[PDB]
Design a protein that fits this description.
The protein has one domain. It has 4 helices and 6 strands; from the N terminus they run βαββαβαββα. Strands 2-5-4-3-1-6 form a 6-stranded mixed beta sheet. It starts with 7 loop residues before the first strand and ends in a 9-residue tail after the last helix.
Length: 154
């Protein structure tokens, strides 16, 4: 019937986190389901991406989307990167069923399909969480502003 059209933010574990707002990860892995459909800000958790996951994922995705993929210069932590439009959230079953091309991209039971990945120009000192949490009134705006400019790639 109705839902809070507020700017929510879902933290992610790098590098994936960045890969999302970058345009490589069009899906999110979570052990829970979120009927939230619309805009969802992606933030990089406090965890740091290992040199094994980045190097591996870099080559892994390169063959999943194309060696001509993109990749960030670094991977920050505890800051808002960008945002992704959550189209739908399928499960290990539906996800692959409909999106069998990215059935491996995620392992979680409930995959959150996102699109229009954009990385904000300015990051804010925020804390991530394994679940969905309403952004800070002050952050909401700033985040909407950081979308004034993008990298040279896009």
């Amino acid at each position: 019937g109705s839902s809070g059209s507020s700017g929510w933010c879902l933290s992610v574990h790098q590098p994936w986190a960045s890969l999302l707002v970058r345009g490589i990860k069009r899906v999110e892995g979570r052990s829970w389901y979120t009927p939230h459909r619309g805009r969802l800000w992606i933030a990089a958790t406090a965890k740091k991406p290992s040199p094994q996951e980045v190097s591996e994922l870099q080559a892994t995705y390169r063959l999943l989307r194309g060696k001509d993929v993109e990749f960030p210069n670094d991977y920050p932590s505890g800051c808002l990167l960008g945002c992704v439009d959550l189209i739908d959230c399928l499960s290990q079953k539906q996800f692959k069923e409909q999106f069998p091309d990215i059935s491996q991209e995620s392992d979680s039971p409930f995959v959150f399909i996102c699109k229009n990945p954009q990385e904000m120009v300015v990051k804010f000192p925020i804390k991530g969480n394994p679940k969905i949490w309403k952004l800070d009134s002050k952050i909401h705006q700033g985040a909407k502003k950081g979308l004034m400019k993008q990298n040279k790639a896009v």
